[PDB]
Design a protein around this motif. Sequence first.
Motif, PDB file in Angstrom:
ATOM      1  N   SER A 120      -1.277  17.533 -13.457  1.00 16.25           N
ATOM      2  CA  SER A 120      -0.390  17.017 -12.439  1.00 16.25           C
ATOM      3  C   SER A 120       0.244  18.001 -11.452  1.00 16.25           C
ATOM      4  CB  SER A 120       0.751  16.348 -13.198  1.00 16.25           C
ATOM      5  OG  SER A 120       1.722  15.828 -12.339  1.00 16.25           O
TER       6      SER A 120
ATOM      7  N   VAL B 187      13.469   7.026  -9.211  1.00 15.09           N
ATOM      8  CA  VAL B 187      12.641   7.898 -10.036  1.00 15.09           C
ATOM      9  C   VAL B 187      12.799   9.353  -9.605  1.00 15.09           C
ATOM     10  CG1 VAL B 187      10.323   8.337 -10.903  1.00 15.09           C
ATOM     11  CG2 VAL B 187      10.977   6.030 -10.222  1.00 15.09           C
TER      12      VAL B 187
ATOM     13  N   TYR C  68      10.160   7.420   3.230  1.00 16.93           N
ATOM     14  CA  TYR C  68      10.295   5.983   3.156  1.00 16.93           C
ATOM     15  C   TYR C  68      11.699   5.536   3.545  1.00 16.93           C
ATOM     16  CZ  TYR C  68       5.965   5.797   0.415  1.00 16.93           C
ATOM     17  OH  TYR C  68       4.660   5.847  -0.014  1.00 16.93           O
TER      18      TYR C  68
ATOM     19  N   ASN D  50      -2.991  -2.079  -9.676  1.00 17.49           N
ATOM     20  CA  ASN D  50      -2.433  -0.733  -9.692  1.00 17.49           C
ATOM     21  C   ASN D  50      -0.963  -0.845 -10.067  1.00 17.49           C
ATOM     22  OD1 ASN D  50      -0.822   1.533  -8.489  1.00 17.49           O
ATOM     23  ND2 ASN D  50      -2.863   2.281  -7.930  1.00 17.49           N
ATOM     24  N   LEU D  51      -0.334  -1.929  -9.621  1.00 16.06           N
ATOM     25  CA  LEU D  51       1.074  -2.185  -9.903  1.00 16.06           C
ATOM     26  C   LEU D  51       1.220  -2.446 -11.395  1.00 16.06           C
ATOM     27  CD1 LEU D  51       1.884  -4.619  -6.950  1.00 16.06           C
ATOM     28  CD2 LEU D  51       1.968  -2.125  -7.019  1.00 16.06           C
TER      29      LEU D  51
ATOM     30  N   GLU E 182       0.862  -1.176   0.000  1.00 14.48           N
ATOM     31  CA  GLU E 182       0.000   0.000   0.000  1.00 14.48           C
ATOM     32  C   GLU E 182       0.901   1.229   0.000  1.00 14.48           C
ATOM     33  OE1 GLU E 182      -4.281  -0.896   0.225  1.00 14.48           O
ATOM     34  OE2 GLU E 182      -2.989   0.817  -0.226  1.00 14.48           O
ATOM     35  N   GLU E 183       1.964   1.158   0.795  1.00 13.86           N
ATOM     36  CA  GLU E 183       2.926   2.243   0.918  1.00 13.86           C
ATOM     37  C   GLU E 183       3.736   2.356  -0.366  1.00 13.86           C
ATOM     38  OE1 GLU E 183       3.175   4.125   4.005  1.00 13.86           O
ATOM     39  OE2 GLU E 183       4.012   5.430   2.452  1.00 13.86           O
ATOM     40  N   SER E 184       4.065   1.207  -0.946  1.00  9.69           N
ATOM     41  CA  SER E 184       4.836   1.161  -2.180  1.00  9.69           C
ATOM     42  C   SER E 184       3.954   1.540  -3.363  1.00  9.69           C
ATOM     43  CB  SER E 184       5.404  -0.244  -2.395  1.00  9.69           C
ATOM     44  OG  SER E 184       4.366  -1.196  -2.568  1.00  9.69           O
ATOM     45  N   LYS E 185       2.650   1.318  -3.219  1.00 14.41           N
ATOM     46  CA  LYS E 185       1.701   1.645  -4.275  1.00 14.41           C
ATOM     47  C   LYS E 185       1.576   3.160  -4.377  1.00 14.41           C
ATOM     48  CE  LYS E 185      -2.747   1.088  -3.730  1.00 14.41           C
ATOM     49  NZ  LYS E 185      -3.192   2.453  -4.118  1.00 14.41           N
ATOM     50  N   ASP E 186       1.473   3.820  -3.228  1.00 18.91           N
ATOM     51  CA  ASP E 186       1.372   5.273  -3.194  1.00 18.91           C
ATOM     52  C   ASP E 186       2.694   5.841  -3.694  1.00 18.91           C
ATOM     53  OD1 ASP E 186      -0.643   4.248  -1.190  1.00 18.91           O
ATOM     54  OD2 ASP E 186      -1.073   6.393  -1.039  1.00 18.91           O
ATOM     55  N   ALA E 187       3.790   5.218  -3.271  1.00 13.37           N
ATOM     56  CA  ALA E 187       5.121   5.643  -3.683  1.00 13.37           C
ATOM     57  C   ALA E 187       5.262   5.396  -5.178  1.00 13.37           C
ATOM     58  CB  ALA E 187       6.180   4.859  -2.918  1.00 13.37           C
TER      59      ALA E 187
ATOM     60  N   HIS F  60      -0.960  -0.973 -13.616  1.00 12.06           N
ATOM     61  CA  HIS F  60      -1.254   0.324 -14.215  1.00 12.06           C
ATOM     62  C   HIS F  60      -0.008   1.209 -14.279  1.00 12.06           C
ATOM     63  CE1 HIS F  60      -3.644   3.671 -15.548  1.00 12.06           C
ATOM     64  NE2 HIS F  60      -3.225   4.419 -14.543  1.00 12.06           N
TER      65      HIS F  60
ATOM     66  N   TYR G 230      -7.199   6.247  -6.963  1.00 11.61           N
ATOM     67  CA  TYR G 230      -6.732   5.720  -5.692  1.00 11.61           C
ATOM     68  C   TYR G 230      -6.501   6.828  -4.667  1.00 11.61           C
ATOM     69  CZ  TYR G 230      -6.252   1.967  -8.943  1.00 11.61           C
ATOM     70  OH  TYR G 230      -6.489   1.022  -9.914  1.00 11.61           O
TER      71      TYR G 230
ATOM     72  N   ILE H 126       2.669   5.594  -7.242  1.00 12.50           N
ATOM     73  CA  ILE H 126       1.794   6.568  -7.876  1.00 12.50           C
ATOM     74  C   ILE H 126       2.605   7.805  -8.245  1.00 12.50           C
ATOM     75  CG2 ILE H 126      -0.167   8.106  -7.589  1.00 12.50           C
ATOM     76  CD1 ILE H 126      -1.395   6.106  -5.679  1.00 12.50           C
ATOM     77  N   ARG H 127       3.521   8.192  -7.361  1.00  9.82           N
ATOM     78  CA  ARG H 127       4.364   9.350  -7.613  1.00  9.82           C
ATOM     79  C   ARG H 127       5.188   9.098  -8.866  1.00  9.82           C
ATOM     80  NH1 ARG H 127       4.589   8.681  -2.432  1.00  9.82           N
ATOM     81  NH2 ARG H 127       6.703   7.818  -2.198  1.00  9.82           N
ATOM     82  N   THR H 128       5.575   7.843  -9.072  1.00  9.92           N
ATOM     83  CA  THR H 128       6.347   7.467 -10.248  1.00  9.92           C
ATOM     84  C   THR H 128       5.448   7.636 -11.466  1.00  9.92           C
ATOM     85  OG1 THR H 128       7.617   5.810  -9.001  1.00  9.92           O
ATOM     86  CG2 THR H 128       7.621   5.628 -11.402  1.00  9.92           C
TER      87      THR H 128
ATOM     88  N   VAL I  59       2.781   9.919 -11.671  1.00 11.14           N
ATOM     89  CA  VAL I  59       2.614  11.353 -11.877  1.00 11.14           C
ATOM     90  C   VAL I  59       3.934  12.019 -12.253  1.00 11.14           C
ATOM     91  CG1 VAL I  59       1.818  13.510 -10.867  1.00 11.14           C
ATOM     92  CG2 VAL I  59       0.787  11.343 -10.161  1.00 11.14           C
ATOM     93  N   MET I  60       5.043  11.440 -11.803  1.00 16.13           N
ATOM     94  CA  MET I  60       6.357  12.000 -12.100  1.00 16.13           C
ATOM     95  C   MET I  60       6.829  11.608 -13.495  1.00 16.13           C
ATOM     96  SD  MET I  60       9.500  12.634  -9.644  1.00 16.13           S
ATOM     97  CE  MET I  60      10.046  11.054  -9.024  1.00 16.13           C
TER      98      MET I  60
ATOM     99  N   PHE J 139      10.393  -1.791  -4.604  1.00 15.25           N
ATOM    100  CA  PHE J 139       9.434  -0.713  -4.804  1.00 15.25           C
ATOM    101  C   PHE J 139       9.990   0.578  -4.218  1.00 15.25           C
ATOM    102  CE2 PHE J 139       5.250  -1.909  -6.481  1.00 15.25           C
ATOM    103  CZ  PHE J 139       5.378  -3.289  -6.584  1.00 15.25           C
TER     104      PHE J 139
END
Lengths: 131, 61, 66, 286, 286, 286, 286
Positions: free
Chosen positions: D152, C33, E193, A86-87, A21-26, A89, D193, A28-30, A32-33, C26
């Motif tokens: 974004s 990134v 993190y 999501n992973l 979940e934490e890595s998924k949000d992390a 996506h 999400y 997500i930044r990848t 948007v980035m 991850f």
Amino acid sequence: RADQLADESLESTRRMLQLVEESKDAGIRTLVMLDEQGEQLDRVEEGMNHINQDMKEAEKNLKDLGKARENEMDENLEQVSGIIGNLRHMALDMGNEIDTQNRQIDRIMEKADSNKTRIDEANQRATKMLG
Amino acid sequence: NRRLQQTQAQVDEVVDIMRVNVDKVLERDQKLSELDDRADALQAGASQFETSAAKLKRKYW
Amino acid sequence: ALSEIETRHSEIIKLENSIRELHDMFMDMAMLVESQGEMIDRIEYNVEHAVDYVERAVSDTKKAVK
Amino acid sequence: AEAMALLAEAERKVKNSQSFFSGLFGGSSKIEEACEIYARAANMFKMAKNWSAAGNAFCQAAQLHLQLQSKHDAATCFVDAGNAFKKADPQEAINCLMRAIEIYTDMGRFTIAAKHHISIAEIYETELVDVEKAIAHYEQSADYYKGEESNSSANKCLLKVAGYAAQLEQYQKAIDIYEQVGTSAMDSPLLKYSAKDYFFKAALCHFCIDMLNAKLAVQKYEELFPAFSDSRECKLMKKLLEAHEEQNVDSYTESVKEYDSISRLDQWLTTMLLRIKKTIQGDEED
Amino acid sequence: AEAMALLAEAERKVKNSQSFFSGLFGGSSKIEEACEIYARAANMFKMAKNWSAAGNAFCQAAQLHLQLQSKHDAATCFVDAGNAFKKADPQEAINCLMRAIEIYTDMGRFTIAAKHHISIAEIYETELVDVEKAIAHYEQSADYYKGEESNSSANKCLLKVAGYAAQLEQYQKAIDIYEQVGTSAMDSPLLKYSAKDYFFKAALCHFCIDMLNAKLAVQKYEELFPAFSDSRECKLMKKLLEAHEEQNVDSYTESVKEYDSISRLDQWLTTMLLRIKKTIQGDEED
Amino acid sequence: AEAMALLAEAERKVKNSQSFFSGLFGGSSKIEEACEIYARAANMFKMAKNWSAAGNAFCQAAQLHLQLQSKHDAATCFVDAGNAFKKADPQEAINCLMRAIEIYTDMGRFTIAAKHHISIAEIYETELVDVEKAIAHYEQSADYYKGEESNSSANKCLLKVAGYAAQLEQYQKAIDIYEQVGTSAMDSPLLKYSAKDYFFKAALCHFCIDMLNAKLAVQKYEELFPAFSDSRECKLMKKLLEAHEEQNVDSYTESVKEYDSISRLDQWLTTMLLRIKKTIQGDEED
Amino acid sequence: AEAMALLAEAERKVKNSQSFFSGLFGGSSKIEEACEIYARAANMFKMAKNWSAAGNAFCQAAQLHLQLQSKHDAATCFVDAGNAFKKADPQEAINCLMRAIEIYTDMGRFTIAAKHHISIAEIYETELVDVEKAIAHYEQSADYYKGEESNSSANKCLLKVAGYAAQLEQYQKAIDIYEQVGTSAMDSPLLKYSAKDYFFKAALCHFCIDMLNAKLAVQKYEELFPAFSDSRECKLMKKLLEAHEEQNVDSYTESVKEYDSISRLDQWLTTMLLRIKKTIQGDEED
């Protein structure tokens, strides 16, 4: 230690649910980035095709100028499994957004060094016929 | 053992994509750095081009 | 029967194992990134403007042949 | 090779020529010289770790450049100056940047303008602690991003705006910002999400409303039940809405303690949840 | 198309003209012509993979280029030379790069100076085996990155500095670097993190400190029970701190054996852990 | 300073010279000057957020820029105008973009042409709701991306084409698209995961099929529960095929109720599932 | 508008001047015009989706572009021609690319020479089935990447080489490649994880040895039993080694049947596992 192994390993799956979940949000930044990076490059190419032209003209102009425990347990894991959705996506889209760009970056580096050379030549031919 | 083996490899398969992610993402890092050394080295000459193109302006214009 | 409850165990831990290690990738990813992001900021920047200076250079060359 | 010497020659040359010195032509070709001079000095200054001097030097080369008609290379220099003062000991690290945006903006380069605009509002907050001007910048900057269809970055900034807005007691204006950034995030399945937390914040933010503005915002939220993600949003909210509509600040403070498990409460949440924990008690002893 | 032939032509033309050959004006086109020659030779040398002949060739072309008036493309040639020698059998790779940085640096190009600076320190370590100088470069380079507000690279370099500093007995200077790289990491919720590992490393590093330099830096950490990422950082540390304050080289060697089940121990940790293991045993029979 | 003034002067100078003023060479330096003028106006308009004026102004500068003979830099302006009108008040958003593609296309820049081509179909769908024309664009654009062997983007477009094809009753034409985008997806072990959803969509899309076209598509799909990802693909499909072949509009409606637990159902899925839910009912009365 | 018209004009102008046509000067100025012509033709041939014609046209424009002296843009044209024939129906896709590399190569642009070199071997394998030449390319290309010290890319290529080298029965030459790519992957702790599959592959490849090698390779492997990643590497290998040394095509094909549950096998593995499964039977039913 039955209950001591069905819970510790489960206590980890719980500390595991958030992990993905934490890595998924992390991740997500990848998303948007790498999306922002793709945009900021669309203009780079624009400025790369912009220089390509101007130089061609300039060069020519210079020539013209020279001359329920497991029920929840599963739910927690199911969420970890669902996250793959999501992973997925991510790795996919960007993964391909990588190829398109890289193959484009090389085309950017070349012309980048190409114009550089034609500038050195133009300068040399220009110096001999300066004021 | 049911749900166990089920959720077992479910992630062992997600352990692969990252192996591809970490790599494909690191290969870019080096390529971009390569463009940073050329793109700049280019404008570096542009500083000469501008001045050179100006010197030609005071000779034929 | 312990032979059955113990089997389940060994399977869960070995599961927990492959997990945490994957998750590690991850994290490092988001870390990679990022570094790349800040590096591209300088790339585009120097390039964008590089086009602005040349845009002025070409504009002069064109007016230097007329 | 002496900066102190260059700074002097540069000055001796930066001056609208006339008489014999002007001859027939002149102006830009002379001011530019002093420009690269000050730049040359600013460099060695940054080499000797004198940053301050380097920055003031870039400021000189910059201003002069403006005195030549080349806002572009100028603004970039102003940025260099800001980079100096920032990692230096004096100030003006805020002045240089403003002097940079006034250029990138009037010039038309809004993209990069917003790029430094956010850096600005980021310093005016982490340093000057001027949340007032900070929000103003985070906002206008997001408006520019929204112009370049850069949804974004635009939202990133909006998030900053609302985020710090809820701290300045601007609870209502905050929920509104969350509503806008929420309506412009569902169009992109690349954000669905995260869209949860938005509703969680907007529902937590209370402009001293005693009604169910939140009970209505939680309902507006679109959730089913087996949602792996949605578990970190409204499910708690409802429990918080009930602990309020019953003046029981014991179930709320317990729910925050439990929820604090499946989802660690970050600074923001803690502060607001405390502002909600107080309203109930104040509704009791009243 | 023969390299030897080119090298000879190049030498034949690389010479300040005078008398009858000069005429009136010298000729930078000559020195540059020779540059193109040597470059053309260095290329075919790299083709046949003679590297030792390519590198020394580039050097020539590079040197000559300086005799022209083109520091830029010259320095880039020095880089080509360094890349050659690097992937070659001789050395010189260190000299070429120093000759490259002196140029990028005096030119006002620190971004790039640092880009090759880190490569340098990476060579002086993975090759020459001279960490005492490598660290010096990893640092000065991190300073340049820190100037270009490029937090990232700056931190990468710092991490290298401290990382090898701990391996060179420099445990305190290491924790210091970890403290700085840790403070300038929380500001951005993008590093939150990894921000754990820093505290774990720092707390592990001990300058023979006979106290709780770590037990003071372990509580300073903001851990959270629900936070599971944290369970991979200080939770262990505390248990190690007790095992040291009681000279029990069994509880420590056991806790590391258990921790190696939830979080694998990389080479680094292993080395330092055994170092502490020795400080303990050593305090028993010492 | 005033945009009105600039727009006016720009008009004065945007005209082929004559007499002494023209001398021998009127040149395009004037038409270009006018371009810079209108751009300078469109700029302050974009600042004032007047957009309308900004866009129309860019259209002026753009058109004139064409009178200059510099298609590239012109088209980019047409894009600026497009970005304006798009996120503005009036229309023209579609016009500018068409006028941009005619240029990128005739010029030979299909790479960027497709970039704005998808933006076009995206506006012609999310706004004009002209699905029939949008699909035509998503498709032709995917063809261009396919030419640039940029598999990525090509698929990002094909997915759109098929996705919105099923909405236009084109079920068969949809499954075929899913088949192609699937075949050119297995050749790359980087699409192994997503390859599921494709088969799920295609198997769901039914052009009033009666046979086992879906049972055959699901058979074509290599599933092995141990390749767990598949669970979010055909496992449901088979159950749906059973509730369909058994004309049980209760088991299918129960299955869609259960699957909505393990894997949420987006808009698309929902609508289509209801269409199949009706094919069953309409078969019950057969 | 008409391609045939342009192709014809282009032809009439693409020819070294002579007689009163040449006069004093003649060459570049003309041949270039023809280049632009053919490019303009290949463009409409590409919009018309004739590709073949577009490609042959680009071949013409490119060749002519070489007849002018400007190798760079020419080579890029050959790339365009390659993309054409590639997405087209005829061949020549291999020739255009070779004609591109010869240029990037003798020019000194090896980085890109390898960029297109891997694309080349990628076509020469998937299409022409010419594996010997494909491997020669993946290899020489990896040598270039290794030259630029671009380790990662060099490894990608090596992986290709070895991977297809084991398919061509070249098992020993494969294990060696895996060894090299292994000792050059542990220097970087960012490949730790990755270092496994290598040992598994190198241990699976068998040059018809009569024992160890593999039993020696699994030994050289440094594993930490409480490991997690490594479970997908040696642990299995041991069981396979035992199933091989001891003619038993029932303990090998079974262990692979179980392993295929916790770690799905890819085409490669299967192909080789079966080859070994055959060596066992071919030692057994003999």
